């Protein structure tokens, strides 16, 4: 108790931390997007607590781990209760949680850093980058260490404790298996150690060097562009790492601008020779990306990005004038910014027709079709923005209309459908070689995005002469299916009215949109489609033959199921695979008002499944006992029969649900009815191990204590085999006959020996029950008792020498072995030698005065056991020749065991002797 | 609020069934174990009945928690797709100043639930133009959306409401409302006249149903009130707000004697 | 056993703090320059923990040593008082770690101070000066 008091705080803390982390892990993995962002960005949430979990604070992880490591209570002290082993498992589980939290923090901090880098919010990106770098370094050093030194890490200490436990080897009956999956745990720890050593940092900590000089040599009048008089300008440099994150350098000192707009800056040559991206900030506004520096580039001019903003200016005339001025001054158009973005894409975003008209002159076909790193061609951006003039100009230039995007395969028609602008589509249709439908990653047609777009885009598409309304995707969802799963009835009504749509369309699993509505419980849509439209509601799904009413009933959707059963259009007699009927399925769900309503409508009480199970039986086969009561109040057959004849009480006892049995007994259901096997329900009660039913059935009828089925096995024997103390004590309180045997001849004492409890053994031995009982085969209790290898039962048996005599020998065994008149003790010792258990053999040797009577050497040679033969030759000083003229070497040669023959040859025994 | 509601709800019963199924089921299990334990005839049988009523209370509160609905809306609508200053207006009108930047945000309009305001859009410099035109994608769930506008780091102002099937969003309504509500009289009157000549509706609703008449009453301007009262139908002069205030109530609160008469 | 249970939490805490500080002492020193500033400037970094280690809170440094000196379990009683020498050694270890942690933060705070002083950045320099 004192040791338990000492170890309880740390073990409770480790268990609580582990369970908390697991629950939060599944909870966070099962969240939405905005929910994910809000939870991860909590000012005082789980991220900060997990970072502090490696601090030496009380509530953290490392303090309990190193405390239990240092105190040494994990190593067992001799044999004791399961407390040292349990704290060892707690330590291993906590270490697993520690490494899992390590990975957890890495992945979520990386996701946050990427999510804030893509937007361009560098202030939060820097904080998340620093957090990720610190977490990675700190956790890597805490797990294994920055290098092999005196720190030794933590996993190495855990392995050291594991080897100490292994070499402790206090016991080995099960601990060799226990230490065996401890070796498996050691291998897993070695694997994860190799993984973390091989894992590289996801963050590039080293930062570039800022510019060495700034100048304003170029003559540009200052009001143009984003250059404002009296406005400070700052620059930063970042490494361009495609695989890893790179830190943003500290911003340069404020620089004032007056009468000049285009600055010329000089950058030092980088030692590693990698391109560096340059970020520019005005006051505290949003930072922008102005360009990239190659290793051998000296002068950088940010006029390229200024032209990008010139083409993206919301105003038209001012943007065109500044674009013309910049082009006169001299700025390239091939420059790229942001996500590989192109100046023509910015012109498309702005929608200015003047800059597009100027650019298309003396242009190139590849430039108009040039995509970004995400595959967004200029026509893609034009369709997404929704402008029409730029789209018309692009079509006149003969750009590719069938352009597609990487990863998510979407044509600009898909973008127009998702956004919902009918003008862009009505301007795109004048373009030739356009395809009405396309195959996406899931094969989603543009109509599948139009239904999301709105009613007007659906009207525009359905007005087209060329349209495939019944398009099928890879997943198998027709446009009606995902138009109605979204609960926008008006768009579905617009789709239906324009042209005929196959309502009875099904998925690969024969799933109808009506089934989706029933399973998701939107009753209004189901009523609308059932009333105003015609539909075959009797269609069954491919797996399980489930129907509309089954889907409505499943997952506790009661109103929809009630509406379907109230209507007479859909039938109720429809039978699914497995035979589960609407009554049976309602029983499975256990809803009361649905059953009351369908009984009010009218249905047979005794519906039959494939195996003729009565609904009362399945009501017993449920967690809700009120189903039985309501069915019997409505009127049900108490003695209903199945194909196997199983009664509801029989099934209830087979499962062991106490409440069902209690309510059945309260309602006084007859227990005389049996199944095909003839098994009484008390047999199933013994199987489960319920007692109150035993007293109840004995009170009703005491004859059932010795009732037998076709198996002819008494309930006492089954209860003894099930190893339940209460039932065995009860039947011995009535004291059932011990001479009752089945066809196998099993006796309760055999089962007690199998369990090995000394208490039942001493009751049976005080009862003076015969231990020479034999079945049809002829085996006796003594052989099974010796096979079990239970020493203290044997000691208590030899304590009472009056009941069992060693000199006396069973006559049946003499008949089975006429040549060898072995005694019970002699043949028992020989069998123990045969059992290959050295401990049992030495037990008998200690009990028996002279071990040479059995002749363990010849027997062991017959059985071919190396260890027994070596032990008897060396430590027992058994003569190799033996009393008999036949040497054990002949037996070993006959058996063919290798090591036994080699050892006997080494002993000096000769094979030449006859 | 959203975090604490979701997280506590998961703690009590859980968002889904699992091996833990919340701590309430553990309390029910330990109480059932106490039941299975041996009990005294009368006194701790009374303890048994009081723990039975405790179990009933726990079942009732568990059912209430499962039936308890969420009071917030984590879903966020989509911002504007493209912006353009197509209107021919001169910049020094209203809050539109040279060298200023404007950030827009959108939010779902839920009468019973709280709705998240979207992240502010990229800054847009304004020069030589004042009235912007915003184009909005069609809402997925087809909900009306409130739109908020912020100049630099000043006080954000609600600017309008967008229907599911409206895209051409012109931005003149809140400009007119602030023109009628500006502390100055002559400048406000001139800019109100300019905006009216440009074209703006009168029945626009802001601040729990207030109208240009309410803004004129609170500001105390007389010339714009005289201009409005001509060709004004009496129903809008007695139009109440969500709280129930009328233009004469606002005039009395402001204390401007002229508009009262 | 009761005496050992009484002194187990304080000895375990002082040993954990001591070994953690010894590890971090050469962990921080052998770190690269760019990661050095980032590691020091963590909002809930080790510097704040060392500053809080002087507080009378349980997780801090003083509560164990002050409890040891007040309860007077460091003085051996009778023969074979193994726990007395153990807690005494823990006391000297805690005092040594306390002196070293005092000497520790001064260098980093001074370094941050002048490092920001060279480029201006006086807002952070004032905070480090006060610290």
């Amino acid at each position: 108790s004192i040791q338990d008091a000492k170890v309880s705080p740390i073990i409770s803390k480790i268990n609580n931390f582990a369970r908390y982390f697991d629950t939060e892990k599944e909870r966070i993995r099962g969240l939405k997007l905005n929910d994910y962002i809000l939870k991860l960005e909590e000012p005082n949430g789980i991220l900060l607590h997990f970072k502090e979990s490696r601090t030496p604070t009380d509530d953290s992880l490392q303090a309990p781990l190193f405390s239990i490591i240092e105190e040494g209570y994990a190593v067992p002290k001799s044999i004791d209760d399961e407390l040292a082993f349990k704290v060892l498992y707690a330590l291993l589980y906590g270490t697993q949680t520690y490494v899992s939290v390590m990975f957890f923090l890495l992945e979520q901090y990386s996701f946050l850093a990427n999510h804030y880098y893509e937007k361009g919010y560098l202030e939060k990106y820097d904080e998340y980058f620093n957090s990720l770098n610190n977490v990675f370094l700190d956790f890597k050093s805490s797990l294994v260490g920055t290098g092999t030194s005196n720190n030794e890490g933590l996993l190495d200490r855990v392995l050291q404790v594991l080897m100490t436990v292994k070499n402790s080897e206090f016991l080995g009956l099960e601990k060799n298996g226990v230490d065996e999956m401890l070796n498996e745990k050691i291998n897993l720890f070695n694997k994860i150690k190799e993984e973390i050593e091989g894992k590289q940092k996801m963050t590039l900590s080293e930062t570039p060097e800022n510019f060495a000089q700034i100048s304003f040599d170029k003559d540009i009048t200052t009001p143009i562009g984003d250059w404002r008089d009296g406005r400070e300008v700052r620059y930063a440099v970042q490494y361009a790492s495609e695989t890893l994150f790179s830190k943003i350098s500290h911003w340069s000192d404020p620089v004032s601008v007056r009468e000049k707009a285009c600055p010329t800056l000089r950058m030092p040559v980088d030692q590693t020779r990698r391109n560096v991206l340059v970020f520019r900030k005005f006051d505290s506004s949003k930072p922008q990306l102005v360009g990239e520096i190659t290793p051998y580039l000296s002068n950088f001019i940010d006029i390229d990005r200024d032209l990008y903003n010139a083409a993206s200016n919301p105003d038209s005339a001012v943007g065109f004038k500044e674009f013309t001025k910049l082009n006169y001054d001299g700025a390239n158009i091939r420059a790229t910014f942001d996500h590989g973005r192109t100046v023509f894409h910015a012109a498309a975003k702005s929608g200015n027709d003047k800059i597009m008209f100027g650019l298309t002159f003396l242009a190139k076909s590849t430039e108009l079709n040039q995509p970004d790193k995400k595959g967004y061609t200029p026509i893609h951006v034009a369709a997404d923005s929704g402008n029409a003039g730029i789209v018309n100009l692009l079509i006149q230039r003969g750009v590719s209309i069938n352009s597609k995007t990487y990863h998510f395969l979407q044509t600009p028609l898909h973008l127009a459908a998702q956004r919902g602008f009918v003008t862009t589509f009505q301007r795109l249709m004048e373009s030739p070689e356009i395809n009405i439908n396309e195959r996406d990653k899931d094969g989603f047609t543009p109509l599948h995005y139009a239904i999301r777009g709105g009613e007007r885009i659906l009207e525009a598409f359905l007005n087209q002469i060329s349209i495939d309304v019944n398009a099928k995707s890879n997943t198998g969802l027709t446009p009606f299916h995902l138009a109605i799963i979204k609960n926008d009835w008006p768009v579905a009504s617009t789709l239906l009215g324009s042209k005929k749509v196959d309502i009875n369309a099904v998925d690969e699993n024969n799933i109808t949109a009506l089934h989706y509505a029933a399973i998701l419980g939107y009753l209004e849509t189901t009523k609308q489609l059932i009333n105003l439209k015609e539909i075959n509601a009797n269609v069954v799904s491919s797996p399980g033959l489930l129907s509309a009413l089954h889907y409505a009933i499943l997952y506790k959707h009661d109103d929809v199921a009630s509406f379907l059963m109230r209507s007479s259009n859909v039938n109720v007699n429809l039978k699914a695979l497995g035979g589960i009927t609407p009554l049976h399925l309602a029983v499975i769900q256990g809803r009361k008002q649905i059953l009351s309503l369908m009984f009010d409508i009218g249905v047979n009480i005794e519906q039959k499944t494939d195996e003729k199970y009565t609904p009362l039986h399945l009501a017993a086969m449920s967690k809700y006992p009120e189903l039985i009561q309501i069915l019997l109040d409505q009127g049900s057959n108490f003695e209903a029969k199945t194909n196997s004849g199983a009664t509801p009480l029989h099934l209830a006892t087979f499962k062991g649900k106490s409440q069902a049995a209690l309510i059945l007994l309260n309602n006084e259901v007859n227990w005389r009815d049996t199944d095909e096997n003839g098994q009484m329900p008390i047999h199933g009660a013994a199987m489960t191990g319920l007692l109150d039913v035993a007293q109840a059935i004995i009170s009703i009828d005491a004859t059932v204590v010795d009732i037998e089925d076709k198996n002819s096995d008494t309930p006492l024997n089954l209860a003894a085999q099930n190893s339940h103390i209460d039932v065995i004590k009860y039947f011995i309180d009535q004291g059932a006959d011990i001479n009752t045997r089945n066809k196998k001849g099993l006796a309760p004492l055999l089962a007690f020996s199998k369990k090995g409890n000394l208490d039942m053994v001493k009751y049976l031995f005080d009862k003076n029950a015969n231990v020479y009982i034999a079945d049809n085969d002829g085996m006796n209790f003594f052989y099974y008792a010796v096979q079990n290898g239970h020493l203290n039962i044997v000691k208590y048996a030899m304590s009472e020498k009056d009941k069992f005599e060693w000199s006396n020998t069973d006559n049946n065994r003499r008949d089975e072995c006429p040549n060898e008149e072995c005694a019970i003790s002699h043949f028992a010792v020989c069998d123990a030698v045969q059992f290959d258990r050295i401990e049992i053999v030495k037990y008998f040797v200690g009990t028996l005065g002279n071990f040479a009577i059995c002749g363990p050497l010849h027997q062991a040679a017959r059985y071919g056991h190396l260890d027994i033969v070596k032990y008897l030759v060396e430590e027992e000083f058994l003569s190799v020749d033996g009393s008999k003229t036949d040497t054990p070497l002949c037996y070993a040669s006959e058996n063919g065991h290798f090591t036994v023959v080699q050892y006997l040859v080494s002993n000096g025994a000769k094979v030449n002797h006859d």
Side-chain angles (χ1 to χ4, degrees), chain A residues 521 523 527 557-564 566 591 593-594:
Chain A
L523 73 164
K527 305 190 203 313
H557 287 261
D558 210 356
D559 43 2
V560 188
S562 296
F563 165 77
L564 276 71
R566 161 166 34 86
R591 299 294 299 273
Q593 65 182 357
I594 195 68

Side-chain angles (χ1 to χ4, degrees), chain A residues 562-597:
Chain A
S562 296
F563 165 77
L564 276 71
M565 46 175 48
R566 161 166 34 86
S567 179
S568 61
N569 290 318
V570 64
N571 74 352
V572 188
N573 299 351
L574 183 63
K575 184 176 183 292
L577 188 153
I580 297 169
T581 62
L583 180 40
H584 296 56
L585 196 49
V587 161
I588 297 298
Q589 306 293 320
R591 299 294 299 273
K592 313 165 221 183
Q593 65 182 357
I594 195 68
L595 189 150
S596 310
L597 172 83

Side-chain angles (χ1 to χ4, degrees), chain A residues 107-180:
Chain A
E107 56 172 327
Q108 278 156 21
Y109 269 124
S110 66
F111 166 62
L112 272 161
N114 212 335
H115 179 90
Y116 272 118
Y117 193 23
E118 65 183 1
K119 293 214 202 84
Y121 282 13
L122 295 175
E123 311 306 290
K124 296 212 52 63
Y125 169 54
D126 195 317
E127 191 285 300
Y128 283 127
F129 182 76
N130 305 355
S131 314
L132 185 52
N133 191 359
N134 293 343
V135 170
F136 179 80
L137 290 170
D138 292 331
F139 273 97
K140 214 195 160 204
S141 175
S142 187
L143 283 173
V144 290
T146 178
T148 288
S149 183
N150 197 37
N151 58 73
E152 189 67 26
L154 171 83
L155 302 82
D156 291 331
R157 285 291 270 299
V158 176
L159 315 165
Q160 177 48 87
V161 176
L162 268 294
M163 282 74 75
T164 312
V165 172
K166 183 112 172 162
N167 308 110
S168 190
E169 60 91 22
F170 286 136
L171 73 164
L173 276 297
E174 182 65 26
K175 177 165 132 184
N176 294 116
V178 176
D179 67 52
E180 186 272 324

Side-chain angles (χ1 to χ4, degrees), chain A residues 410-710:
Chain A
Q410 323 164 0
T411 190
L413 275 180
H414 281 102
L415 301 196
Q418 275 272 65
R419 281 279 169 283
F421 292 163
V422 297
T423 311
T424 76
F425 178 75
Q426 90 186 352
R427 194 41 41 61
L428 274 164
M429 294 299 291
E430 297 69 351
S431 165
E433 67 183 1
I434 190 166
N435 189 359
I436 63 183
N437 63 7
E438 298 279 277
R439 288 298 155 267
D440 293 358
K441 182 175 72 68
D442 292 296
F444 279 134
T445 188
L447 183 63
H448 292 171
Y449 290 173
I451 62 170
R452 214 91 61 71
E455 262 191 339
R456 311 220 205 291
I457 198 65
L458 291 175
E459 183 178 1
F461 292 178
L462 294 172
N463 186 275
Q464 273 324 110
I465 62 170
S466 51
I467 177 64
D468 186 74
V469 187
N470 195 0
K472 186 83 81 153
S473 71
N474 304 357
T475 302
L477 277 296
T478 61
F480 202 60
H481 269 78
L482 73 164
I484 194 167
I485 197 167
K486 194 184 175 187
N487 295 115
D488 301 288
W489 170 238
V491 302
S493 168
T494 300
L495 182 82
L496 292 195
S498 311
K499 191 264 183 182
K500 181 264 290 180
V501 179
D502 186 74
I503 318 297
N504 199 2
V506 296
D507 189 358
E508 288 94 39
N509 288 19
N510 284 47
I511 302 299
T512 303
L514 188 153
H515 290 60
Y516 277 141
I519 196 67
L520 289 174
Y522 293 100
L523 73 164
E524 185 286 333
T525 51
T526 76
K527 305 190 203 313
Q528 183 63 255
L529 66 91
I530 278 181
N531 297 4
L532 273 296
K533 313 299 309 153
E534 60 88 20
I535 181 56
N536 207 39
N538 291 318
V539 188
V540 294
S541 76
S542 183
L545 295 174
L546 294 174
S547 191
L549 61 83
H550 299 86
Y551 268 54
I553 283 182
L554 183 63
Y555 308 114
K556 275 74 178 173
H557 287 261
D558 210 356
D559 43 2
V560 188
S562 296
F563 165 77
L564 276 71
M565 46 175 48
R566 161 166 34 86
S567 179
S568 61
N569 290 318
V570 64
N571 74 352
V572 188
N573 299 351
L574 183 63
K575 184 176 183 292
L577 188 153
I580 297 169
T581 62
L583 180 40
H584 296 56
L585 196 49
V587 161
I588 297 298
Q589 306 293 320
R591 299 294 299 273
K592 313 165 221 183
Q593 65 182 357
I594 195 68
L595 189 150
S596 310
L597 172 83
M598 62 155 157
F599 182 76
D600 170 42
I601 308 294
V603 65
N604 189 359
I605 62 170
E606 317 290 301
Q607 294 297 109
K608 300 302 178 186
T609 187
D610 291 331
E611 302 83 14
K612 298 289 299 303
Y613 278 58
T614 289
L616 183 63
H617 309 176
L618 187 62
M621 289 310 81
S622 176
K623 310 305 169 186
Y624 293 99
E626 58 86 20
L627 291 178
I628 297 169
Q629 295 298 109
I630 193 66
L631 291 175
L632 303 186
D633 295 356
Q634 290 182 347
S636 307
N637 186 15
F638 292 165
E639 318 308 312
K641 298 295 289 183
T642 62
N643 63 345
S644 300
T647 75
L649 183 63
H650 268 100
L651 294 197
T653 60
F654 295 156
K655 291 301 105 183
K657 313 190 182 187
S658 54
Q659 68 275 16
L662 292 183
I663 69 175
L664 284 159
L665 295 186
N666 165 256
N667 300 19
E668 301 285 348
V669 181
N670 189 358
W671 59 274
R672 170 54 46 204
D673 203 328
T674 61
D675 57 338
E676 56 178 10
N677 291 318
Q679 310 183 0
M680 186 64 72
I682 65 170
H683 281 161
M687 295 298 102
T688 66
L690 310 181
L691 194 46
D692 57 313
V693 287
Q695 289 85 19
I697 193 66
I698 298 299
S699 69
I700 300 175
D701 178 33
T703 302
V704 310
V705 65
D706 301 344
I707 195 60
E708 297 168 3
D709 53 341
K710 64 176 71 174

